[PDB]
Amino acid sequence: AVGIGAVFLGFLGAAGSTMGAASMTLTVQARNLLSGTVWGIKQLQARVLAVERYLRDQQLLGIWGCSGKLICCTNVPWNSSWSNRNLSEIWDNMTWLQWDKEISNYTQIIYGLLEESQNQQEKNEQDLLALD
Amino acid sequence: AVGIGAVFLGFLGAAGSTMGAASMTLTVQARNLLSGTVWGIKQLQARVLAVERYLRDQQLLGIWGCSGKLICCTNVPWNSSWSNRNLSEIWDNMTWLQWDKEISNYTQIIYGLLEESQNQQEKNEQDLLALD
Amino acid sequence: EIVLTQSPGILSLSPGETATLFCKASQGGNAMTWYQKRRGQVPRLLIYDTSRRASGVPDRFVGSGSGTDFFLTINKLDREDFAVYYCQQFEFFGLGSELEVH
Amino acid sequence: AENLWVTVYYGVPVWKDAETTLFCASDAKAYETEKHNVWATHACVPTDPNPQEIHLENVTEEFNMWKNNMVEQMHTDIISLWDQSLKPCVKLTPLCVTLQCTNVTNNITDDMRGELKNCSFNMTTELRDKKQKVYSLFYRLDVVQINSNKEYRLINCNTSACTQACPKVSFEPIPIHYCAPAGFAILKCKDKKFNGTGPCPSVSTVQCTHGIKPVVSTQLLLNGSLAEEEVMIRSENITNNAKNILVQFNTPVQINCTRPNNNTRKSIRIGPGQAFYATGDIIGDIRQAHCNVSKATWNETLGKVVKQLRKHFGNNTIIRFANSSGGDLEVTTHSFNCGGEFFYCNTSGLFNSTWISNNDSITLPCRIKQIINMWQRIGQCMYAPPIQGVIRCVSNITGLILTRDGGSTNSTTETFRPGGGDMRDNWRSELYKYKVVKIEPLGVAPTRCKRRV
Amino acid sequence: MIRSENITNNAKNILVQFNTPVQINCTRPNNNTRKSIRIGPGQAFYAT
Amino acid sequence: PNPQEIHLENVTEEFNMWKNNMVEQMHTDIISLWDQSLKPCVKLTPLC
Amino acid sequence: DIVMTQTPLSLSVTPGEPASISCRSSQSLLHSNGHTYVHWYLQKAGQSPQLLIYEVSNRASGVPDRFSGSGSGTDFTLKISRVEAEDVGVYYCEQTLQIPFTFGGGTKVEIK
Amino acid sequence: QVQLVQSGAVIKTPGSSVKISCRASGYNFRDYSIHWVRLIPDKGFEWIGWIKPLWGAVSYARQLQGRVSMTRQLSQDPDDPDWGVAYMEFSGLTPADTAEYFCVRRGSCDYCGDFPWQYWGQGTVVVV
Ligand SMILES: *[C@@H]1O[C@H](CO)[C@@H](O[C@@H]2O[C@H](CO)[C@@H](O[C@@H]3O[C@H](CO[C@H]4O[C@H](CO)[C@@H](O)[C@H](O)[C@@H]4O)[C@@H](O)[C@H](O[C@H]4O[C@H](CO)[C@@H](O)[C@H](O)[C@@H]4O)[C@@H]3O)[C@H](O)[C@H]2NC(C)=O)[C@H](O)[C@H]1NC(C)=O
Ligand SMILES: *[C@@H]1O[C@H](CO)[C@@H](O[C@@H]2O[C@H](CO)[C@@H](O[C@@H]3O[C@H](CO[C@H]4O[C@H](CO)[C@@H](O)[C@H](O)[C@@H]4O)[C@@H](O)[C@H](O[C@H]4O[C@H](CO)[C@@H](O)[C@H](O)[C@@H]4O)[C@@H]3O)[C@H](O)[C@H]2NC(C)=O)[C@H](O)[C@H]1NC(C)=O
Ligand SMILES: *[C@@H]1O[C@H](CO)[C@@H](O[C@@H]2O[C@H](CO)[C@@H](O[C@@H]3O[C@H](CO)[C@@H](O)[C@H](O[C@H]4O[C@H](CO)[C@@H](O)[C@H](O)[C@@H]4O)[C@@H]3O)[C@H](O)[C@H]2NC(C)=O)[C@H](O)[C@H]1NC(C)=O
Ligand SMILES: *[C@@H]1O[C@H](CO)[C@@H](O[C@@H]2O[C@H](CO)[C@@H](O[C@@H]3O[C@H](CO)[C@@H](O)[C@H](O)[C@@H]3O)[C@H](O)[C@H]2NC(C)=O)[C@H](O)[C@H]1NC(C)=O
Ligand SMILES: *[C@@H]1O[C@H](CO)[C@@H](O[C@@H]2O[C@H](CO)[C@@H](O[C@@H]3O[C@H](CO)[C@@H](O)[C@H](O)[C@@H]3O)[C@H](O)[C@H]2NC(C)=O)[C@H](O)[C@H]1NC(C)=O
Ligand SMILES: *[C@@H]1O[C@H](CO)[C@@H](O[C@@H]2O[C@H](CO)[C@@H](O[C@@H]3O[C@H](CO)[C@@H](O)[C@H](O)[C@@H]3O)[C@H](O)[C@H]2NC(C)=O)[C@H](O)[C@H]1NC(C)=O
Ligand SMILES: *[C@@H]1O[C@H](CO)[C@@H](O[C@@H]2O[C@H](CO)[C@@H](O)[C@H](O)[C@H]2NC(C)=O)[C@H](O)[C@H]1NC(C)=O
Ligand SMILES: *[C@@H]1O[C@H](CO)[C@@H](O[C@@H]2O[C@H](CO)[C@@H](O)[C@H](O)[C@H]2NC(C)=O)[C@H](O)[C@H]1NC(C)=O
Ligand SMILES: *[C@@H]1O[C@H](CO)[C@@H](O[C@@H]2O[C@H](CO)[C@@H](O)[C@H](O)[C@H]2NC(C)=O)[C@H](O)[C@H]1NC(C)=O
Ligand SMILES: *[C@@H]1O[C@H](CO)[C@@H](O[C@@H]2O[C@H](CO)[C@@H](O)[C@H](O)[C@H]2NC(C)=O)[C@H](O)[C@H]1NC(C)=O
Ligand SMILES: *[C@@H]1O[C@H](CO)[C@@H](O[C@@H]2O[C@H](CO)[C@@H](O)[C@H](O)[C@H]2NC(C)=O)[C@H](O)[C@H]1NC(C)=O
Ligand SMILES: *[C@@H]1O[C@H](CO)[C@@H](O[C@@H]2O[C@H](CO)[C@@H](O)[C@H](O)[C@H]2NC(C)=O)[C@H](O)[C@H]1NC(C)=O
Ligand SMILES: *[C@@H]1O[C@H](CO)[C@@H](O[C@@H]2O[C@H](CO)[C@@H](O)[C@H](O)[C@H]2NC(C)=O)[C@H](O)[C@H]1NC(C)=O
Ligand SMILES: *[C@@H]1O[C@H](CO)[C@@H](O[C@@H]2O[C@H](CO)[C@@H](O)[C@H](O)[C@H]2NC(C)=O)[C@H](O)[C@H]1NC(C)=O
Ligand SMILES: *[C@@H]1O[C@H](CO)[C@@H](O)[C@H](O)[C@H]1NC(C)=O
Ligand SMILES: *[C@@H]1O[C@H](CO)[C@@H](O)[C@H](O)[C@H]1NC(C)=O
Ligand SMILES: *[C@@H]1O[C@H](CO)[C@@H](O)[C@H](O)[C@H]1NC(C)=O
Numbered sequence A, B: 001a002v003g004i005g006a007v008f009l010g011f012l013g014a015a016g017s018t019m020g021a022a023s024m025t026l027t028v029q030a031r032n033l034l035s036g037t038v039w040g041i042k043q044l045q046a047r048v049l050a051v052e053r054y055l056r057d058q059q060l061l062g063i064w065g066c067s068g069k070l071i072c073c074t075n076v077p078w079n080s081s082w083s084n085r086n087l088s089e090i091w092d093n094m095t096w097l098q099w100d101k102e103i104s105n106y107t108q109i110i111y112g113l114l115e116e117s118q119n120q121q122e123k124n125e126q127d128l129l130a131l132d
Numbered sequence C: 001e002i003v004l005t006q007s008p009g010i011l012s013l014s015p016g017e018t019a020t021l022f023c024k025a026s027q028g029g030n031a032m033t034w035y036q037k038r039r040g041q042v043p044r045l046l047i048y049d050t051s052r053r054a055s056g057v058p059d060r061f062v063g064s065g066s067g068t069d070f071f072l073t074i075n076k077l078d079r080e081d082f083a084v085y086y087c088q089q090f091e092f093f094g095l096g097s098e099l100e101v102h
Numbered sequence D: 001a002e003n004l005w006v007t008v009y010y011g012v013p014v015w016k017d018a019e020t021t022l023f024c025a026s027d028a029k030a031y032e033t034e035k036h037n038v039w040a041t042h043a044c045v046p047t048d049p050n051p052q053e054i055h056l057e058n059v060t061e062e063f064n065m066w067k068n069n070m071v072e073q074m075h076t077d078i079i080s081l082w083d084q085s086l087k088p089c090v091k092l093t094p095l096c097v098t099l100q101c102t103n104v105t106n107n108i109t110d111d112m113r114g115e116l117k118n119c120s121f122n123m124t125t126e127l128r129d130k131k132q133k134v135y136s137l138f139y140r141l142d143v144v145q146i147n148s149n150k151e152y153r154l155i156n157c158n159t160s161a162c163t164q165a166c167p168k169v170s171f172e173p174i175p176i177h178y179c180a181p182a183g184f185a186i187l188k189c190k191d192k193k194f195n196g197t198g199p200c201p202s203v204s205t206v207q208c209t210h211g212i213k214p215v216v217s218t219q220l221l222l223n224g225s226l227a228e229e230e231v232m233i234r235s236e237n238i239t240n241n242a243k244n245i246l247v248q249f250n251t252p253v254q255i256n257c258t259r260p261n262n263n264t265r266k267s268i269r270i271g272p273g274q275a276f277y278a279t280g281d282i283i284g285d286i287r288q289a290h291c292n293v294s295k296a297t298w299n300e301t302l303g304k305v306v307k308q309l310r311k312h313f314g315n316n317t318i319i320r321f322a323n324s325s326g327g328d329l330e331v332t333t334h335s336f337n338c339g340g341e342f343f344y345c346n347t348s349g350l351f352n353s354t355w356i357s358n359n360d361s362i363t364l365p366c367r368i369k370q371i372i373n374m375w376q377r378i379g380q381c382m383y384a385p386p387i388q389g390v391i392r393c394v395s396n397i398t399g400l401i402l403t404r405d406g407g408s409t410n411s412t413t414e415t416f417r418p419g420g421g422d423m424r425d426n427w428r429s430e431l432y433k434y435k436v437v438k439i440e441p442l443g444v445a446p447t448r449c450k451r452r453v
Numbered sequence E: 001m002i003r004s005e006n007i008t009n010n011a012k013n014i015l016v017q018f019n020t021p022v023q024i025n026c027t028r029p030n031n032n033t034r035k036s037i038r039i040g041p042g043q044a045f046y047a048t
Numbered sequence F: 001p002n003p004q005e006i007h008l009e010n011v012t013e014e015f016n017m018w019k020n021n022m023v024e025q026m027h028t029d030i031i032s033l034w035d036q037s038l039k040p041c042v043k044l045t046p047l048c
Numbered sequence G: 001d002i003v004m005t006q007t008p009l010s011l012s013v014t015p016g017e018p019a020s021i022s023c024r025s026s027q028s029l030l031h032s033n034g035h036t037y038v039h040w041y042l043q044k045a046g047q048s049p050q051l052l053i054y055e056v057s058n059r060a061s062g063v064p065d066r067f068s069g070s071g072s073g074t075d076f077t078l079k080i081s082r083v084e085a086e087d088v089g090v091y092y093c094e095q096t097l098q099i100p101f102t103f104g105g106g107t108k109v110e111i112k
Numbered sequence H: 001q002v003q004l005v006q007s008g009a010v011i012k013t014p015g016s017s018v019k020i021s022c023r024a025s026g027y028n029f030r031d032y033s034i035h036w037v038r039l040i041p042d043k044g045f046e047w048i049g050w051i052k053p054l055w056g057a058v059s060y061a062r063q064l065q066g067r068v069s070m071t072r073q074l075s076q077d078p079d080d081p082d083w084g085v086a087y088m089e090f091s092g093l094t095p096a097d098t099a100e101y102f103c104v105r106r107g108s109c110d111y112c113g114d115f116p117w118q119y120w121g122q123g124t125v126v127v128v
């Protein structure tokens, strides 16, 4: 029939698959990220650590150009000193966990580059809107 | 004069009115949704239940096309097996509490339909942006 | 006072058949309870609120009816079910109908 | 046209029934009295002015008060903060000594019995070596006989050594405004004709309830929330005999309870910094503590509740009253608090009449008990200390807690009887207007617009 | 399955976990009637 | 490490130290953790 | 393997009386995406099976209210409300929640 | 489980007064009512009255007042707080009162009145 349990995977379902098939379904890891007298305080400090580290990822996402769009292009070019890999491989050769080792030095340079490339784009949108 | 207390209602003000007059003022139920040694823990588990179930509604809203727009069209058609009602009535005949009984079986089918209709629209926006 | 009247008196049957038991109240809009008492044993509950069942009662026991009429229909009669059956509303009991073998 | 599309709507008025933890709102005027002279005046939240009681036109809502929550939570936490005010107070273990008690100095007639016993015993001083010989006074409902001579002991000394109550704190009721947390509303039924269940066609939304007085009376509810127009009676199935009939009447009946012994206090020192307050001499006369209601007022109020009771049991029904056939001392009596001491009265001059369909005061002889076992927990009691001077209070009887009599005969009479029982039935006379709903925004409705690309 | 840290070490235990269970039948055959000695107010002490 | 003590040029600010808070909070909690270090310790009743 | 048992074996139904065919899985069939992955199929003898009820308590695009789906976790009932002459055939219960797809043993309904 | 154990059968004289224990065990005794049902031959069942054993508030039948009295005894120890015992002193007997006496209890059922009694006692027959 229509609707089967084969290609409709679950949480962390495509965790070994290639990036071109992991970016097909990103919402399944997205929605299970917030919901799911001293052992009540083990409940409190487990809950306010979940809603805190969710908001921290929604803030670093927020101050770039991506409010809730969940996939978004940007303006910074890709300097080959970061990864030096071909484009035609890294969407069907590697997998995401193999990528996260391959780049982990160069984050906080990209995250610093993204904020300035947004705030430069933000006021330049205003200067276009101000003259007209 | 200008500015009267008649049509400027309060919290849950239009709760019996029709949908065409309840969607006139939706912000009044919106803004009173977050703000307003053992009975301090009755304060803590009342606060982190308020900010948690607010973020849960802001996440289900977020992964559809509606970041903070508070009224937004979408792309899924309205199958008449859900409601089978006329359009010309349900904005001036019924009221919202009469609607919530009339549809409550068919939620989590609509909420599942909305995520796939966004993520299909999300990557197709990228494939339009990638070729040019 | 609420008075309860049981209809059939002695209802004699054979095992495997289906018996009905009709009990008539005198005040509408209430619940009903059906007590089964075997010969020389402690009575047990079968029905409360005119439709539900007690803990550990087979699903061949079913009761229905509202207003002033209340039925207890037993499908697929066993050999143990030939007992006295009692109505009860709030304190008042029926005099009890009897089930006998044929 | 027919190509209808889903449009979500955030922030939309609908609700479902739910139950979550509510909190206080003590009134801000009661904050001047310093550092918990009553329980929960610094612990929980200062209130707001002018709570936005706003009407909800064209709204009906199915209320309920018997399967209601928040009268279950109110019984839960009031038990708990009663235990919060006893953990600082002094444990009263070293008082379990074999007493030696004689009659109090009084004109002992054979008809009367000794209400107050003398009870001189031994008790350690602040030094661990020496043992002073001190005397006190004790009620007869606090000593039992160890069985020549006559030597008693405390009644709670078997199975439950239990604390004193610090005389800094006070057992007076202050108002408590229950408030819903963020995201929850409290619907309030404004109907002037509203029994227990049933759709209330005139509701209103608040955020904090009106001032509830937590009192503890078993029969004869006190000091709270009179009705609008008539005398309303309300129950579960009224042809049931185990569900109480919470009568709540319209004009108040003023009660005038007192205790005329002077009852001078004195402080016995248990050890290092642990005082124990015992009643010493009594100055004046040994008189019985009593209560008064006006006979012209009370009989007129029973004339009201015998009219509304005939609406459920028909006319020509000879309604009579009786005096709570049996039970413990705290249910056969009108048990209440007054100024810090615990009166147990005797409502048997009140509930004694018969009614057919065609200036002086009633004195109720009360009696006082010092140890207190409210809510009947297994290992607790609470020795309330004595208080100086003549004690007098004035309260409004607002509602009764009746109970029908489970007949099985073809009689006409229906002998109603008072009975306290569970302490929840007091707070169901205050929390029947309020239910708590959960605001559930983010609805969905079809209309004719599509998200353009 | 046997499993350890460095198996040529002598201070790390070898947690053997075997496949079919071996049923043990531990008992104590004294009848050992209890009784309650009262320490004070509401403090019982149960001694055999 | 190295707390970011960073200057605020062209800034004046009306300070106060007598109606200041946080010397009231510091007196409050130092009383309280002085009581935290005495609840494990031994009560000295039988020395009287 | 998960077991799909079908009750009863065969039913001789009158035209008009509500008929019920029940099937029970080995575990619950509710998935996190929001659909219950229990299905029902119609097969005539000498004819390929056709889907009737997908995503139960919702009808398909071409079947009327003569078929219905209801139940909960591990308990699934197919209800045939109004019987026609074409209602005869063998019905199958089948899960599309997990891999593999397991089918029912078959419930024959005939005419009287 | 819930178990209600009664007392044994007695032989009394006209003018005496029985006392029938009913020892409850297996549930918290401070919560649920205990009724008393008398079963007479040729008359069917007959109610007597309940006892709410938290405080001990009782209420009898209309035609048995002055002749019945129900007390209770709780369990005042935290080592075993579930058990308890209800009583019944049926005073002023008659040869027309020889019957079987049952102590019952409602079911922990919550859609369930006080009167649909689930667990019953073993039954005590009393001969006059
Ligand atoms: C709550 O309040 C009610 C109302 O007061 C109390 O009920 C009263 O209880 C007292 C004590 O039992 C009752 O007093 C007794 O009354 C008996 C009947 O009195 C009539 O008969 C005598 C002659 O027998 C006449 O002189 C009298 O005028 C009446 O016509 C008396 O017989 C009793 O006296 C006997 O006992 C005492 C004590 O041993 C002796 O001193 C006497 O000499 C005599 O031997 C006694 O007087 C009173 O009647 C009750 N009121 C009623 C029934 O309306 C409740 O007790 C109280 N609640 C609690 C828990 O106590
Ligand atoms: C004392 O009085 C109270 C109220 O005054 C009575 O309580 C009501 O009793 C009735 C009947 O027992 C209850 O009705 C039952 O409701 C169940 C739950 O339904 C809920 O949801 C519906 C839909 O939203 C609401 O309309 C409803 O109010 C409930 O909130 C149903 O499951 C029941 O149906 C079952 O039983 C009937 C009859 O046996 C069958 O026909 C059905 O097919 C099904 O098997 C039934 O409808 C009602 O909920 C109770 N509460 C209230 C507040 O009204 C007591 O029964 C009464 N007690 C005595 C001893 O007299
Ligand atoms: C029903 O409501 C009425 C409301 O009037 C209530 O009656 C009042 O109760 C309060 C306290 O319960 C009484 O207030 C007392 O008044 C005396 C005389 O003025 C004061 O001396 C008292 O102070 C004592 O407590 C202080 C702190 O503990 C001590 O420091 C001090 O030395 C005193 O010991 C206290 O303020 C008041 O007199 C009555 N009456 C009136 C007319 O207000 C009644 O109690 C309520 N009923 C119930 C059952 O709760
Ligand atoms: C409870 O019983 C005690 C024990 O008897 C009573 O206390 C004692 O009462 C007597 C008689 O009043 C006192 O004796 C008198 O003392 C004064 C002063 O010393 C003396 O001048 C008199 O000649 C007479 O001897 C005694 O002091 C007093 N206290 C003690 C410790 O013995 C007590 O009065 C009784 N309770 C009540 C409420 O009366
Ligand atoms: C409700 O009112 C009735 C009156 O009809 C009260 O009954 C009376 O109760 C008192 C005390 O319980 C009885 O006095 C004593 O009786 C015992 C024997 O039971 C005897 O040993 C004593 O010497 C003394 O006489 C009185 O006789 C009794 N009267 C009647 C007619 O029953 C009842 O107590 C009241 N209930 C409450 C809770 O106050
Ligand atoms: C409960 O109600 C009954 C019925 O009204 C009361 O019984 C009656 O009480 C009065 C007052 O005591 C009795 O009056 C008699 O008056 C004469 C002269 O004053 C006096 O000599 C008698 O000793 C008696 O007081 C009346 O006979 C009596 N009736 C009956 C049938 O007993 C009863 O008093 C009420 N209970 C309470 C606590 O008030
Ligand atoms: C309080 O303590 C005193 C001091 O021991 C007790 O007095 C003695 O009690 C014993 C035991 O009964 C007697 O054999 C002595 O003769 C008593 N001596 C004196 C001087 O009285 C006293 O019994 C204790 N109890 C009370 C109530 O006073
Ligand atoms: C604890 O002590 C109390 C006080 O004596 C006991 O209560 C009395 O026990 C006797 C037993 O001979 C009874 O005759 C009395 O009727 C009881 N008094 C009351 C007011 O009921 C009690 O039995 C002791 N034990 C427990 C477990 O509480
Ligand atoms: C509380 O009021 C409601 C509404 O008036 C009552 O509900 C109905 O009362 C009538 C009166 O006899 C009954 O015939 C109906 O069966 C009741 N229910 C419904 C759904 O209509 C209710 O009985 C009242 N309760 C009390 C204790 O008086
Ligand atoms: C209760 O007794 C006390 C003790 O005697 C009375 O208080 C005394 O009052 C007089 C004047 O009224 C003063 O001269 C005394 O100094 C007071 N004594 C104490 C110890 O305070 C009190 O008046 C009595 N109560 C009543 C209502 O008269
Ligand atoms: C209860 O006591 C109060 C005060 O002690 C009484 O109220 C007084 O009543 C008299 C008589 O009419 C009036 O002269 C006073 O002005 C009232 N004072 C106050 C403050 O109200 C009341 O009447 C008593 N009630 C009963 C039933 O005895
Ligand atoms: C007891 O009853 C009296 C009389 O109704 C109450 O006094 C009323 O209090 C309210 C509260 O503000 C006023 O609005 C009324 O005007 C008062 N009426 C009269 C006649 O004075 C009194 O509050 C009640 N409660 C207590 C504890 O005394
Ligand atoms: C657990 O298993 C692992 C993998 O089989 C073992 O790791 C290797 O074992 C061989 C066997 O001699 C060694 O030569 C290697 O040096 C080990 N390490 C690596 C990185 O290959 C490990 O020794 C086993 N542990 C135990 C206690 O048996
Ligand atoms: C252990 O000893 C107890 C105490 O005698 C035994 O319990 C008795 O059992 C008999 C019948 O089996 C009863 O008649 C007694 O009333 C019981 N006594 C008590 C105090 O309960 C028990 O049977 C013994 N254990 C074994 C395994 O035999
Ligand atoms: C990251 O940097 C460390 C040293 O700074 C280096 O050893 C490592 O190889 C780098 N990672 C990659 C993926 O090159
Ligand atoms: C929702 O489904 C239940 C059974 O699944 C049905 O009884 C009910 O009528 C449905 N709701 C609506 C509004 O049709
Ligand atoms: C003291 O109280 C008892 C209590 O029963 C009493 O019997 C006695 O008469 C009273 N008086 C005397 C002098 O003992």
Ligand SMILES: *[C@@H]1O[C@H](CO)[C@@H](O)[C@H](O)[C@H]1NC(C)=O
Binding pocket: D299, D300, D303
């Ligand atoms: C009580 O009030 C009624 C009301 O009319 C009156 O008839 C009666 O005389 C009053 N007194 C009584 C019953 O003692």
Ligand SMILES: *[C@@H]1O[C@H](CO)[C@@H](O)[C@H](O)[C@H]1NC(C)=O
Binding pocket: D314, D315
């Ligand atoms: C009882 O009397 C009242 C008097 O107001 C009347 O309205 C009512 O109809 C009567 N009851 C009956 C059943 O007639």
